[PDB]
Structures are given as C-alpha cells and as structure tokens.
Amino acid sequence: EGLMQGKRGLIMGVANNHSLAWGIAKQLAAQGAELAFTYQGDALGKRVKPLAEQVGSDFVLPCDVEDIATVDAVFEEIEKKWGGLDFLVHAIGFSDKTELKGRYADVTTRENFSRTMVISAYSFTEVAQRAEKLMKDGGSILTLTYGGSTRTIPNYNVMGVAKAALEAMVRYLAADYGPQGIRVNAISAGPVRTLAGAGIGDARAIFSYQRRNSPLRRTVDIDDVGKSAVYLLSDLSSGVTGEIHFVDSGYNIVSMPTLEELKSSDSERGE
Amino acid sequence: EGLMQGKRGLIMGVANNHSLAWGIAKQLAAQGAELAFTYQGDALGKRVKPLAEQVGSDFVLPCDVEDIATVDAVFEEIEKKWGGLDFLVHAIGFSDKTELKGRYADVTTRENFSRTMVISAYSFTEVAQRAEKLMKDGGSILTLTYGGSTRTIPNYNVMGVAKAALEAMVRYLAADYGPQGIRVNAISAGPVRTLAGAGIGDARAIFSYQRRNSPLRRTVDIDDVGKSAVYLLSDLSSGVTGEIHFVDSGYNIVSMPTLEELKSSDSERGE
Numbered sequence: 001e002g003l004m005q006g007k008r009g010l011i012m013g014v015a016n017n018h019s020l021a022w023g024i025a026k027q028l029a030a031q032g033a034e035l036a037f038t039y040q041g042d043a044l045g046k047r048v049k050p051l052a053e054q055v056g057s058d059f060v061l062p063c064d065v066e067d068i069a070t071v072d073a074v075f076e077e078i079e080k081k082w083g084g085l086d087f088l089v090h091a092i093g094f095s096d097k098t099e100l101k102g103r104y105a106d107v108t109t110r111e112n113f114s115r116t117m118v119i120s121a122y123s124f125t126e127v128a129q130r131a132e133k134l135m136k137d138g139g140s141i142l143t144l145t146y147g148g149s150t151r152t153i154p155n156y157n158v159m160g161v162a163k164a165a166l167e168a169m170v171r172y173l174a175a176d177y178g179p180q181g182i183r184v185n186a187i188s189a190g191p192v193r194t195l196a197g198a199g200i201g202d203a204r205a206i207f208s209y210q211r212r213n214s215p216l217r218r219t220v221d222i223d224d225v226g227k228s229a230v231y232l233l234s235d236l237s238s239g240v241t242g243e244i245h246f247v248d249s250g251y252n253i254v255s256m257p258t259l260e261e262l263k264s265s266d267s268e269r270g271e
Numbered sequence: 272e273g274l275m276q277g278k279r280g281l282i283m284g285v286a287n288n289h290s291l292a293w294g295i296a297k298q299l300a301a302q303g304a305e306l307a308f309t310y311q312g313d314a315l316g317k318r319v320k321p322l323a324e325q326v327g328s329d330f331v332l333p334c335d336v337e338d339i340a341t342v343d344a345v346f347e348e349i350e351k352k353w354g355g356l357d358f359l360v361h362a363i364g365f366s367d368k369t370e371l372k373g374r375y376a377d378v379t380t381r382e383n384f385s386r387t388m389v390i391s392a393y394s395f396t397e398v399a400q401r402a403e404k405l406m407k408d409g410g411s412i413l414t415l416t417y418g419g420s421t422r423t424i425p426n427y428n429v430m431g432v433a434k435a436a437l438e439a440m441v442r443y444l445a446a447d448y449g450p451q452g453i454r455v456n457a458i459s460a461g462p463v464r465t466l467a468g469a470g471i472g473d474a475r476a477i478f479s480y481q482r483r484n485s486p487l488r489r490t491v492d493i494d495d496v497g498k499s500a501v502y503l504l505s506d507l508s509s510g511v512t513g514e515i516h517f518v519d520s521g522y523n524i525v526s527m528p529t530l531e532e533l534k535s536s537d538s539e540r541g542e
C-alpha cells in the first residue's frame with residue numbers, strides 16, 4: 001500500500017534532524033521504504049545512528065565522498081547485505097564558507113573550486129556509477145540542487161557553478177541509464193530553515209526575500225522536499241527522468257518582488 | 272490512506288478511454304478522489320458517462336469552453352452540489368487539423384489562430400478564474416502541455432504557439448493564486464496515441480522518433496501521466512507551483528537521436 005513498500009535505498013547526506021536528507025528519509029520510511037544511511041565522520045555517525053533507528057534502520061555506514069575508497073566500501077556492503085538497490089538519494093554539498101560571501105569574482109580560488117566540484121558535483125556521478133551496477137531491474141536516483149545554478153544569487157558564488165555542473169550530470173546520466181530503466185532526477189529546493197525566523201546577517205536578507213516574494217508566500221520545509229522525493233523515487237514518476245524539478249514555492253517563476261515591496265524600495269532607493 | 276481521500280475535483284477533457292484526462296481520472300479515483308466530468312458535444316455524452324460510471328461518478332455535464340455560458344453552468348452546478356472544489360484538471364486542446372500539416376508559415380490563418388488560442392489556452396484562464404471562487408481553503412489546478420511550446424516540432428505549428436501561451440498562463444496564475452494556497456501547474460506529456468494526437472500530419476513518424484530516442488526508450492502512457500497528475504494535485508506537491516513538469520520519458524533533455532540512429536541517417540542522407 002505504501003508508495004515505497006518493499007523498496008530498498010541509500011540516503012547520503014543526513015547530518016541532523018534539520019537536514020533535507022532527513023526530511024526525505026522520514027517520508028520514504030512512512031511509505032514503507034527500507035533505508036540505509038551514510039554519515040561523514042564518527043561524530044555525525046553518533047547522530048545518524050539514532051535517527052536511522054527512529055525510521056527502522058540499523059544499516060548505517062561511514063562515507064567521505066572525497067575518499068573514493070570509503071564510497072567503494074559503502075556499495076560493497078550494500079551488495080553484501082541487500083544484493084541490489086532500488087533507489088539512491090544524494091544530498092551532499094560543500095564549499096569553503098569564506099568563498100560564499102563577497103563577489104564570486106573576488107573571493108573564488110582554484111583550490112576551493114576543484115574541491116567544491118568534486119564534493120558537490122562529481123560525487124553524484126561516482127555514486128550513480130556504483131548504484132547502476134546494483135540496479136539490474138531499474139531504479140531511481142535523485143540529487144538536490146538549487147536555482148543559483150541558472151540565475152545569480154548573492155553569496156551563492158561557486159556553489160552556483162557547482163550546481164550547474166550537477167544539473168548537467170543529471171541530464172547526461174539520465175540519457176545514459178534511461179534505456180536500462182534507471183531514472184535520474186534532481187529536486188531544486190527552495191531555501192529551507194527549520195529554525196525560527198529568517199536568521200542573521202546577509203543570509204537573513206537573502207532568505208527573507210525568498211520567503212516574502214515566493215508565490216506560496218512561504219519557504220518549503222523538509223517535509224515538502226521529502227514528499228517530492230517520494231514522488232521521484234517511487235513508481236508515481238515512472239515517466240520522469242532527467243528533470244530538474246523545482247520544489248521552491250514557485251520562487252523560480254517570478255522576476256520581481258511584490259508590488260508593495262517594489263514601491264517601498266523605489267521610494268527608499270530611488271531611480 | 273489514498274492520496275486524494277476526501278478530495279473533490281473536476282476533470283475537463285475526457286473523450287474516450289484513451290484520453291489523457293481519462294488516465295488522470297482513473298489514478299485520482301484509485302487514490303480516493305470524488306470526480307466530476309465535462310464532455311464536449313452531445314455525441315460524447317454516451318461515451319463519457321459510462322467511463323465516469325467505472326470510477327463511481329454520475330456527475331457528468333456538457334461543456335464547450337468556446338461557449339462561456341456552458342462553462343458558467345458547470346461551475347454553478349458544482350457550487351450547488353458540492354459548494355467547493357479541491358482540484359481542477361484542464362485537458363482540452365483544439366486546432367484545425369488542416370493547419371497541423373505543412374509549414375506553420377504556409378498554412379496558419381488568423382481565424383484558426385484565434386480559435387485555437389481561446390480553446391487551447393485562454394479556456395484554462397477562464398476555468399481557473401471560476402475555480403478560484405470555489406477554492407476558499409486552497410486547491411490545486413492542472414493543465415496539460417507539450418514540449419512543442421519551446422522547441423520546434425514539424426507540423427505542430429500553431430498548437431506550439433498556443434502551448435507557449437498556456438505555459439505563460441500557468442506562471443501568471445500561479446503567481447496570482449499562490450498567496451491564497453492555490454497551486455497551478457502543468458504536465459508537459461510525451462506523445463500519446465489519442466484522438467487529438469492523431470490530428471497532426473505524419474503523426475506516425477513524429478511519434479516513433481520520440482519512442483526510439485527518448486532516454487526511457489518508450490513513450491508515456493495515460494497511467495504515467497495520471498500518476499504524475501496525482502502528485503501535482505495531491506498534498507505530496509505542497510511545495511510546487513508554477514511548474515512545467517515534464518513527463519515525457521526524458522525526451523526534452525536530449526539533442527540528438529541515438530548514436531545508432533545518427534549513423535544510419537548519416538549513411539542514408541549524407542553530409
């Protein structure tokens with residue numbers, strides 16, 4: 001009866017119970033999925049193990065996607081225990097925070113660019129390559145992206161470049177794996193804040209703008225993202241592959257803020 | 272348990288058991304929805320009424336969207352019998368078939384342009400306007416489009432122009448209605464052998480191209496489309512509005528046919 005009943009899959013990217021990957025995990029488990037989780041570092045493992053237990057999983061493995069040996073070992077354990085995979089969720093990203101402020105042109109370095117590209121984008125290709133060997137009967141693979149890939153957002157900087165590369169990977173992988181019945185998609189999530197308010201500093205001003213000016217007049221939460229993940233990972237989306245699916249309260253469709261905010265900014269800042 | 276349990280909605284566009292609207296109706300009914308139907312033309316009443324009976328509905332009303340009095344009469348009847356709507360499905364398209372063969376520039380007339388625009392695009396605005404008054408606590412509105420809106424397809428001609436206008440309406444309506452909790456979306460479906468579908472010249476060659484060269488190597492059926500409609504009309508998609516959602520086997524992401532087909536066409540047709 002559940003949308004994922006009898007399906008088994010791997011969730012990469014839970015750090016705590018505010019993670020987008022955790023919202024995805026909770027919705028998948030409610031729909032009957034059997035889950036495995038990765039965690040980055042012993043400290044996070046002690047957080048992820050009890051969260052996994054809450055949704056009925058004791059299959060929790062260490063992984064640092066920058067160290068490909070740990071990734072190989074994850075899929076070796078999945079093959080040993082399950083022998084196959086029905087789905088994979090990639091919800092992993094990183095960039096040096098010092099380069100996520102100021103202008104992209106001023107702050108970005110090659111060292112951060114290359115590391116960001118590996119962790120935030122190429123790791124998706126690497127785990128897709130390994131998942132494919134375990135999806136002989138088809139499957140569904142999902143990653144998380146953000147609209148800074150295709151429209152410029154202050155401070156998002158080299159992460160926007162990394163997400164643009166990630167979205168192209170979604171397309172090439174979907175074209176590669178489609179004929180074997182493996183679907184590859186992304187959710188382009190709106191900004192998420194599980195904490196109250198809009199926050200502090202630059203980030204508060206960027207977040208509150210999206211809250212005030214998205215069509216739904218709210219930011220999505222990790223349950224919205226998780227329910228859309230259930231759709232893309234389940235047979236409901238059997239016709240869908242290569243899709244960059246916006247789950248962002250419609251924010252991507254608008255050009256401008258509300259008329260009330262246009263007028264206040266016009267008077268405050270001038271011609 | 273059903274994703275649409277307790278929800279009531281209107282489906283416009285069933286013509287027979289191959290219609291996209293019918294696949295949508297079957298999936299919604301299987302998720303617990305209570306359904307109302309319109310049908311175009313007296314002779315279609317005897318085809319739509321037994322289909323609606325298969326999903327437990329005899330709320331079936333004539334409607335020709337070109338005659339706004341019949342549309343008003345439908346929504347008046349919904350207000351009297353239900354007092355409210357939870358969702359609306361717009362699956363209506365029309366163009367003079369003589370202008371869906373040949374070059375767009377050679378065959379299109381103003382008379383067909385204006386009638387195609389009213390029936391295939393503006394009727395969506397008209398039924399959304401009427402649905403809004405009956406969705407006091409929110410709702411979801413869905414239409415169906417095709418990728419000929421944004422990439423040219425031979426013979427699709429003024430239907431592509433009408434779908435481009437329809438997709439803009441999805442965005443403007445989503446921006447208007449989002450603050451009151453009404454989501455507005457479209458499915459861009461792959462090709463399906465329907466009555467309307469066969470109206471395009473050389474339908475067979477255009478259809479088989481998408482079959483052979485889509486990533487999934489199949490064209491979607493009305494069950495694929497119906498399940499995606501369940502997603503967009505249900506609470507699973509609570510974070511989604513203004514979205515042109517491709518349910519087309521990934522076809523929109525590719526530039527070219529398969530390498531095998533590229534080589535055969537290269538040999539057969541030359542430089």
Ligand SMILES: NC(=O)c1ccc[n+]([C@@H]2O[C@H](COP(=O)([O-])OP(=O)(O)OC[C@H]3O[C@@H](n4cnc5c(N)ncnc54)[C@H](O)[C@@H]3O)[C@@H](O)[C@H]2O)c1
Binds near residue numbers: 016021
């Ligand atoms: N937070 C948002 O508002 C938002 C919006 C849109 C998209 N996203 C994307 O969603 C994904 C999840 O981010 P989040 O917001 O849930 O934050 P998060 O901090 O909870 O999740 C990011 C995860 O990536 C993991 N990670 C980072 N470097 C890694 C490495 N080298 N090896 C293995 N794992 C590594 C972290 O351990 C963490 O579990 C990211 O890709 C992010 O870009 C987030």
Ligand SMILES: NC(=O)c1ccc[n+]([C@@H]2O[C@H](COP(=O)([O-])OP(=O)(O)OC[C@H]3O[C@@H](n4cnc5c(N)ncnc54)[C@H](O)[C@@H]3O)[C@@H](O)[C@H]2O)c1
Binds near residue numbers: 284287335468
């Ligand atoms: N068939 C495909 O390949 C395809 C692909 C993508 C999108 N679509 C869209 O799906 C929708 C449904 O078409 P279909 O393929 O299911 O074909 P169909 O022939 O089963 O349905 C088209 C419907 O439009 C109705 N209609 C036409 N003019 C009307 C009018 N004046 N008033 C009321 N209803 C009217 C017809 O009665 C019919 O029920 C259309 O918008 C079409 O453009 C179709």
